[PDB]
Amino acid sequence: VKNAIDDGCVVPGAGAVEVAMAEALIKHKPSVKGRAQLGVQAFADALLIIPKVLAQNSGFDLQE
């Protein structure tokens, strides 16, 4: 919480920003090769593990 009171900026939590980049990572933006396109495609999904693991640890689906 000091990192909130030291920093004028605070990043919003609850995984709302992870779904936000995964599409904001919208692809062929890595039209470069397709290795970075995987590097982003692999990365877009790693973002969501916290939004997953909670809805996971909560009811329903981590995915649905």
Place this chain on the structure above:
Amino acid sequence: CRNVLLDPQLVPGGGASEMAVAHALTEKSKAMTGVEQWPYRAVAQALEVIPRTLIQNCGASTIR
């Protein structure tokens, strides 16, 4: 047709006809508050499988 004819009472299929009787049975069991309460408590809960199964079948979270 004959089931409609033999019984001319249309009853709602599934959980509507299901969870309905259960509370009666429980209340029954509870109003009886003997040992047979447990069979009714078993029976009323025995009903809930099919809607659960339907939720099992449909792809949603049943206990919810």
